[PDB]
Structures are given as C-alpha cells and as structure tokens.
Amino acid sequence: SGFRKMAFPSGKVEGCMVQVTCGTTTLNGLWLDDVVYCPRHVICTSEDMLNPNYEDLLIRKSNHNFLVQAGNVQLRVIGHSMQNCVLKLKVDTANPKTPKYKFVRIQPGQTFSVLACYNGSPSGVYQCAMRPNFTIKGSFLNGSCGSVGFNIDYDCVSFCYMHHMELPTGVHAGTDLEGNFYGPFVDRQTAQAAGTDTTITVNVLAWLYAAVINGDRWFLNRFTTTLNDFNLVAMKYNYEPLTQDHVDILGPLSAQTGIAVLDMCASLKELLQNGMNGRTILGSALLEDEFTPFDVVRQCS
Amino acid sequence: SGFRKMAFPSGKVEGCMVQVTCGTTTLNGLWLDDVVYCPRHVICTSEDMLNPNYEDLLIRKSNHNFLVQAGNVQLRVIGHSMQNCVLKLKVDTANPKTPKYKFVRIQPGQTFSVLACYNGSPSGVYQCAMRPNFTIKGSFLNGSCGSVGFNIDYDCVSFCYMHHMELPTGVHAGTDLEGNFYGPFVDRQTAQAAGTDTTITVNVLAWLYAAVINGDRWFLNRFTTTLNDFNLVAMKYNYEPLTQDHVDILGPLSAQTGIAVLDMCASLKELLQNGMNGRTILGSALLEDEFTPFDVVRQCS
Ligand SMILES: [Au+]
Ligand SMILES: [Au+]
Fold this sequence. Notes:
Strand order of the largest sheet of chain A: 5-4-1-2-3-7-6
Bound molecules: gold ion
PDB class: viral protein
Active site (chains A, B): 41, 145
Cytoplasmic side (chains A, B): 1-301
Distance between the termini of chain A: 10 Å
CATH architecture of the domain at 201-300 in chain A: Orthogonal Bundle
Helix content of chain A: 10-25%
Radius of gyration of chain A: 22 Å
Largest interface: A-B, 46 and 46 residues
Protein name (chains A, B): 3C-like proteinase nsp5
Oligomer: homodimer
Number of helices of chain A: 8
Subunit structure (chains A, B): 3CL-PRO exists as monomer and homodimer. Only the homodimer shows catalytic activity. Interacts with host FBXO22; this interaction promotes the proteasomal degradation of nsp5.
Shape of chain A: elongated
Order of helices and strands of chain A: HEEEHEEEEEEEEEEHHHHHH
C-alpha cells in the first residue's frame, strides 16, 4: 500500500539529453535520431529577449554556430530549421540511445514527468501537471530551458513538453515537441499573465478515490449530489466543471471502491464547504489535483 | 525559480534492476558487478512469513533455485550467501551498466530517491525520507520488494535503502544494502509498530528558507527566539530537538537570505502556535519536512 507523488523512470530520457550552445547562450536539447530539438531562443541574448525578430536573427546563424555536446563528444550539425518555437538541428550521427517515442500534445489537466537539466546533464525528476491556464508549477532555474516532460507507456516514451519561459508570476510556460506553445504565451520577455488557476476537479476525485483504498476515509460521508448541483459549488471555489467524460474515467475507481462518482462529489462538496478541520488526506493538508485517474490505477495496479 | 519535490535521475539505477524468482515468489534485485542483492525473504512463502527460520530454509536452497532475469536474458548463479537480511547472489557475467556506487547507511531525517520496481522492471520514481522512527512513507505494492533508495553525487550513486516490509500501520520498513534493517524491524510478519513519528525540524527550516527566496514570505515575522526556548515549543508539537549542528547546516541558507537561523525558528514557532490561517507555503497547506538543507541548495544552485 501507500500513495506518493510518483514520476516515470527518467532513464530513457537521460540518454537523449545534450547541450546546445549558440554564441553566448547555453541550454539543453533533446537528441532523437539525427535531430536535436531545443528552444529557438538559444539564438538570442539577454537584450534580444526584450523583442526578438526570430526570423531575422536566424538569418545570421549557420550550421557551425550551433554547438551540440553529448558529454565528451561533439555532434556535427549539418542542417537547421525553425519549427514554430523549437529548433531542429540535424546532425550526422544518430542517437544510439533513442527509445521508442512519439510527439504528443497533452490536454489541460493531464500529468507528465519532467527531467530538470542544466548544461545537458540531468539534475532531477519530478511529476508535473498541465494547469488549466496552460502553465505548470515546476522547478526551473536558469539554464533549465530545453528540459522536457514525458510519459512512458510500456516501451513508448511520449514526449509532450519543453520548457521555454518563466513568467513574472513565478510559474512556467513552454511548448510541445512541435514548437507550439501551451496557451497564449510567446518566447519573449514581456508582461505575460496567466488566467485564474482553476482546480482540475476530475483529478481531485481520483485522488480522493486513492485515499479510500489506503485508509483515509474520514472524509467519507452520508450525502449524495447531482452533477449540475455539484458544478454549482465547484464553480464557486474555482473548480473545473465536471463533465460526463470525467465521470466515466473514474468508473474503474468507483467500481472497485463501490462508492458512486456522485457520492464522491458530495464528500468533496463538503470538503469545499467545511474545509478540512485541520485534518489531512493522504498526508496532505489540501486537496491535491495533480493525479489523473490513470495515475491512480497505475499506482494501485 | 520554482520549488518542487524532486528526485534524482533514476537512469543509472534502472540499468541495475533485475528479477529474482526463488520457487514461487518473485521480486527485484540490485545487479552490481557480478552480485545480485535482494531481500532474503524470497526463499519464503506466505506461510513462512508467520515465523521463518531463515537459516533453515536456506539449507534447502541451491544455486539453480535462484532465477535472476534481466529482461530477455537469464543470469547464471554460481554462488549465494546470506548477509543479515539481504541475499548476495553471485553471477558469472558482470553488469555492463554498473555505475560508480557505494553502500552508505543514511541517518534518520536524510532524504533519498526510490525507484519502484515490479518483476525487475522500473515503474516509477519518487523522493523519500528516513522518518525519525526509522520508517518511510513510500508507495509500495505487492512485488515491490527489492526496490532501492539512492542518492547521486555527480557520478557516484550512493545506494542506501532496500524495501522489505509493509507494517500493519501503512508505512514501510527496509534495510541498507548490507542487510541491516533501519530500526527495530525484522523481516517477519508480526505485530510491529513504529514510534511516534516526529518531524525533522532541520528539514522544516530549510524548507522555509526555500519559500523565502521564492516569494512566499507571509510567514516572515518580527520575532526572534533562543535555541533552548524554541526546543520547548518544538517538543510540544512532536518536533525533533534542534542542535548546534542543524543550525550550522542552515548557515548557507541563512547567509544568502540574511535571515538568522533563530529568526526562522521564531517564525516557525508562530506557525506551530497559530497554525497557517488557511494559507499555503510553497503550494502546501502543511509544513513539509522532506527537504534536507542540501536538497534546497541543490534546487537553488
Ligand atoms: Au534557460
Ligand atoms: Au514484495
């Protein structure tokens, strides 16, 4: 038994992490096959970030200006192009540690594991979630740009995130592995603000289902509710509106616990209306919303 | 910026994870050099766990009774011995993915990253801490025995934990890589209880120092205190008594923030005496004590 914030084994991704140095700036790149993916702001300095015509600055850059390093080995760049906000550095030698992988753009609320990297070397791994305002609450210092978020299905490593920016409000923003930013954020240093960070409601119920099968049952209570009326209380406390799909995904969680999805919404409804009375659920004094229903069934498999 | 619960990159440890099957039971083993380390309860069934003379059951076991599997490769066992509560299965082929490693027995309060494994395959990685009652609050299902906890220093992978038991109270217990259990727990299914889980106080102050450099400063307050008098309030709320060593380890954290260690103890003292008024620190509604002072300086490096 036991429940914890778990991240995927990052071993397959560590073998894809390289260092990219373009002029004076340095960050990390994702080495898959014979292509190295890195944020396109590597071709910019601190003054360009104020407002960078990225197409103009790429005109002055050539193949030998991109230094790809994989430990004590230097990769030879023989081609480069700009795909949205990412850089595709074609190299001559393929990555021998390339795993089974795809490029998947995740949805708001889905979770993924992030490998923090600096100078192409992995520093740590933690679990993250795509907040409804299309930001993430990760740990990213300077030089962490190029770090990726991934999911692992048996043998397939599903790359989904790449760090780019840190907003002036403390959170972070980035793109998928195709270069398209998650949300209305641009790779430019300006006054960017994210929306009101609502709570992934389907991820809270899945987390409450994990507390039931682990001992924490003091929040279980003798009330039920309807989907429309629970969404009224959920909308007041800045929660995501629950849909019929979210109810279905918790089906397996409801089938094993024998607690209906609407009965869990009522118990949650009382936690929003009465608080927690100083008590804890699964070692947390607040309601955790960074566990997908699939994250629970995987940890309780 | 940003602060999160980070675990070490588990890539170096994934290359050391094998499957050990002795008779009807199966679990994971740590393949370093030509030795495979696994809990010695692999030679026991469900009925033996009631009370197992481990020396007697090992008399009936030979080399061919231990099946070591590394994916689609079977390892040949040519030697086996019992070191405390671990099993040393000598094999004929050395592990090519053996990293730089040592066997270090950590102290209560220190942190380490755990790789959850089932049937010799890594499932996830999460950060853990050695609670003062010598247990851990990890996530371990059936078949997770043999999973290890580790720290990584540049190139040295410091192995420190190996999962063995799940107590009837929900927490877990295990040994170091030399077989010696952490605490007064035995590899036997009986009525074992851990002591009162106190709070690692030095790890709370280091966590509060991380909140200062990240924005969360509402808990900063205009009071100071002494070490002896803070330990009076700390002893009431089941906290670890603060020593002069704990004060010194926070030196770097106090030097950069310009907040004295005693000033942080006073702010914490008010958090224990007044609660949190429903507010959060670093996204948590309680005081987190699973961050060593070195865990903070590493994340703020
Ligand atoms: Au960066
Ligand atoms: Au086990």
